[PDB]
Design a protein around this nucleic acid. Structure first.
Length: 297
RNA sequence: ACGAGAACGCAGCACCAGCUGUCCAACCUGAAGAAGA
């Protein structure tokens, strides 16, 4: 709809649980936390939170794009029911991201499992080796897991019905970085809003299968109906609260288990902005709203 | 309210020690300060 294309000119560190590892993408709660921190910095966190909770701004999580090829995580479809020939989900196991336009080819088979993998070539991971220099003690080494994007490669976020506030926070987020060691030399990108009409065709279409495009958690009143002919994967979201005015000490937020952003559902749900920090001075939010791409299955 | 915050891959270390740019080889060979009539 309004694809936020991210062009990174520095290696990124998106940690899953450890500083020594990096993942190639970042989630929607990570982007929401970054934008909320920017809004706190410029003093309208409440306006941004109301925009996000009232669905004025709702965004997927970051996906790879490689030379105007927008990719989507391989959806967890209840297919492979073709029980005669081929290799459904056999060679479709090392394939992590499928092109968003080639999704109909993947649905009915014919997508080349091998060719879709060497075609998918975005940068490469690295380990940065560092120390804390101590003038008289022994210097303690530590290392940071990083990912470097390629020349015509980056990440993109699906935003529908963009907002002036979202564009203003995205401009400020350029000069603060995104990811782990952004105050060191790791969070650095340029962004475009780049309205697209090919992608709008996919998201204006209806279907019997809803591909979840962001880490989402249905509310308790709808989790039961969401779990009906669903093919999902449950992911833990947590970590330490990143703020200056919370608890006067480093404290981990509550662990939130959400549906991973490749899950497919037949019943649509709209998640929630969950408060995973309640004992501190300010609320801590975990964006778990549902972004859906509908297909025919 | 970004599995995140803070953290120099940093400190000491001579590209250095020994070793003739040396050995062999005639500036040499031949030539009337001399003759008209």
């Amino acid at each position: 709809m309004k694809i936020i294309k991210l062009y990174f000119e520095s290696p990124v560190h998106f940690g899953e649980k450890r500083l020594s590892e990096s993942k190639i993408t970042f989630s929607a709660d990570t982007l929401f936390s970054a934008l909320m921190i920017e809004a706190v910095g410029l003093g309208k966190e409440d306006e941004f939170y109301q925009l996000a909770s009232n669905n004025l701004v709702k965004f997927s999580d970051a996906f790879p794009f490689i030379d105007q090829y927008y990719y989507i995580p391989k959806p967890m479809f209840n297919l492979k029911l073709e029980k005669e020939d081929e290799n459904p989900s056999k060679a479709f196991k090392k394939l992590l991201y499928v092109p968003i336009d080639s999704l109909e080819d993947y649905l009915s088979g014919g997508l080349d499992a091998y060719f879709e993998r060497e075609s998918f070539n975005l940068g490469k991971l690295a380990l940065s080796e560092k120390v804390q220099q101590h003038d008289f003690k022994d210097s303690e080494p530590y290392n940071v897991g990083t990912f470097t994007f390629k020349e015509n490669t980056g990440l993109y976020v699906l935003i529908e019905q963009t907002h002036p506030l979202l564009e203003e926070l995205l401009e400020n987020l350029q000069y603060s970085g995104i990811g782990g060691k952004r105050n060191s030399g790791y969070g650095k990108f340029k962004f475009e809003i780049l309205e697209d009409s090919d992608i709008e065709d996919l998201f204006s279409a209806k279907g019997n299968r809803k591909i979840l495009l962001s880490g989402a958690l249905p509310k308790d009143a709808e989790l039961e109906q969401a779990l009906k002919n669903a093919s999902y994967l449950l992911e833990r979201r947590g970590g330490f609260v990143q703020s200056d005015t919370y608890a006067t000490n480093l404290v981990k937020k509550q662990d939130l288990y959400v549906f991973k952003s490749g899950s497919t559902f037949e019943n649509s749900f709209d998640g929630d902005i969950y408060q995973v920090g309640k004992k501190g001075n300010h609320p801590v939010y975990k964006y778990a709203k549902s972004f859906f791409l509908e297909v025919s299955v």
